[PDB]
């Protein structure tokens, strides 16, 4: 005789969903995404001083 | 040091159904239990009393029973319809748990 029960007073918090754009650190980035990066060889970024 | 009390512990898993609150309704996240002379010392110069009357649940919590059920019933005779009444008794009692 093995009885299976379930509480009605207390519920869990399984997942803690942390988004990076919720953080204060997301200033220091420029978060632009490719949906194609693995197809790319050496990409370059220019500066004129 | 009192901040070292309230920040050395990771908040637990369960979310209660009813939550303790203020008259304002802000939820409370902890309980200190002290002796009597320590409570008199902390309430003079180190702490502030911000509220006096709280909102507290009264009812206990209950359950949803989905238990393994047992059937014992005497059967007079050996027929088809008289042996299916053990089977009907399963769904007669599993209905009563709802």
């Amino acid at each position: 005789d093995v009885e299976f029960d379930a509480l009605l007073g207390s519920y869990c918090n399984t997942l803690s969903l942390v988004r990076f754009l919720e953080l204060g650190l997301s200033v220091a980035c420029v978060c632009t995404k490719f949906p194609e990066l693995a197809y790319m060889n050496e990409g370059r970024v220019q500066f004129e001083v | 040091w009192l901040v070292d009390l309230t920040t050395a512990t990771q908040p637990s898993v369960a979310v209660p159904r009813l939550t303790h609150a203020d008259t304002r309704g802000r939820p409370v996240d902890g309980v200190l239990v002290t002796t009597a002379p320590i409570k008199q010392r902390l309430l003079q110069s180190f702490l502030k009393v911000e509220d006096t009357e709280a909102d507290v649940p009264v009812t206990y919590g209950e359950m949803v029973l989905n238990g393994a059920n047992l059937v014992t019933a005497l059967v007079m005779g050996k027929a088809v319809r008289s042996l299916d009444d053990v089977g009907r008794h399963l769904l007669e009692m599993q209905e009563e748990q709802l």
Side-chain angles (χ1 to χ4, degrees):
Chain A
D1 288 329
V2 180
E3 187 181 4
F4 292 156
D5 293 335
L7 293 177
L8 295 170
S10 291
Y11 293 155
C12 292
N13 288 325
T14 61
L15 292 181
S16 66
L17 294 176
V18 175
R19 294 179 180 177
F20 180 73
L21 294 174
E22 296 290 325
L23 295 174
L25 192 147
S26 69
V27 178
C29 304
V30 177
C31 287
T32 58
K33 66 178 71 174
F34 290 162
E36 61 278 7
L37 191 145
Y39 294 104
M40 189 172 74
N41 287 319
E42 292 179 353
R44 292 179 181 178
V45 172
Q46 292 179 357
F47 293 102
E48 295 184 355
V49 170
Chain B
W1 181 68
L2 297 173
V3 176
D4 288 331
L5 288 177
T6 62
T7 60
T9 59
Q10 294 178 359
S12 178
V13 177
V15 175
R17 183 179 181 270
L18 296 172
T19 62
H20 298 274
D22 295 335
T23 58
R24 294 178 180 178
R26 184 175 177 181
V28 183
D29 294 329
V31 171
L32 288 176
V33 175
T34 63
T35 62
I38 298 169
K39 185 177 180 179
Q40 292 178 358
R41 182 177 292 171
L42 293 175
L43 289 174
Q44 291 177 359
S45 64
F46 293 158
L47 293 173
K48 298 295 288 184
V49 175
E50 291 182 354
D51 190 80
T52 305
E53 293 181 352
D55 290 334
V56 170
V58 177
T59 62
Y60 294 98
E62 294 179 352
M63 290 179 184
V64 176
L65 302 176
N66 190 0
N69 193 358
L70 183 55
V71 169
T72 60
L74 59 89
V75 175
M76 295 299 291
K78 296 183 291 294
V80 176
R81 298 292 182 184
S82 65
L83 291 176
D84 289 332
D85 291 332
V86 176
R88 298 292 183 184
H89 185 75
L90 289 168
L91 294 180
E92 182 65 29
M93 294 178 70
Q94 290 181 358
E95 184 177 1
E96 294 293 328
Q97 292 180 358
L98 291 182

